């Protein structure tokens, strides 16, 4: 707020407009990047109240009714671990943390309920055991391998999730 600066800058040119346009374009680009990355679907699917996934446990990554900003425990650890005038201002993102978390919840519900069918159109309910059998068939493993070792594979997945949360808890 000095008039001499304005007097000496009006004759200097219009670099300020260039910088403002560049910053606005950058902000728009980041908003578009977030919009493209997180909003892969236009329907917010919800996990059914009963959770019978053939022994697989998803309460670790699914949201809980305790209202921790509608985020899972892994998401809570991720948020907690990350630690964050003179004409400088910070524009808040268009998509808030709750909105991104609800996108994540919808994506998780779609993945664990309809498999990959919801990504190609309408969501198609299917038991998680049959979805895992389809995925095993995708990698060239027959369905009977899953069906005769379903408990072992569920236990292995739960253990892997446990090691994941342990690493995200203590290991930096």
């Amino acid at each position: 707020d000095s008039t001499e600066c304005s007097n000496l800058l009006l004759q200097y040119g219009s670099f300020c407009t260039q910088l403002n346009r560049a910053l606005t374009g950058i902000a728009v680009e980041q908003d578009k990047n977030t919009q493209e990355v997180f909003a892969q679907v236009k329907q917010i699917y919800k996990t059914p109240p009963i959770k019978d996934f053939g022994g697989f446990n998803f309460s670790q990554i699914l949201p809980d009714p305790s209202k921790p900003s509608k985020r899972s425990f892994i998401e809570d650890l991720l948020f907690n671990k990350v630690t964050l005038f003179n004409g400088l201002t910070v524009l808040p993102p268009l998509l808030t943390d709750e909105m991104i978390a609800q996108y994540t919840s919808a994506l998780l519900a779609g993945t664990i309920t309809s498999g990959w069918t919801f990504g190609a159109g309408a969501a198609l309910q299917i038991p998680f055991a049959m979805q895992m059998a389809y995925r095993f068939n995708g990698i060239g493993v027959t369905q009977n391998v899953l069906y005769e070792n379903q408990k072992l594979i569920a236990n292995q997945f739960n253990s892997a999730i446990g090691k994941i949360q342990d690493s995200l808890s203590s290991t930096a």
Binding site: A106, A123, Q125
Partner: protein
Amino acid sequence: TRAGCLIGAEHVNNSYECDIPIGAGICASYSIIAYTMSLGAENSVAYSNNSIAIPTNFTISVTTEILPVSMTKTSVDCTMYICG
């Protein structure tokens, strides 16, 4: 809102698709109304351990995607531009 303060638009309790992105989950649309943008349709899928959904029909969908390949080639003569 946490993004500042808006004057001239009536706040509504409904949720529509975002038209003019104000920020921090707040959008504006045309009087001028300001609301919180809706993420999409809310539906619950009937999941069960012995139930499946199989399509009985199909749709052939044609979509259009635009991809820039090149821009205008501009040449600047520094001696002519600066000095003339």
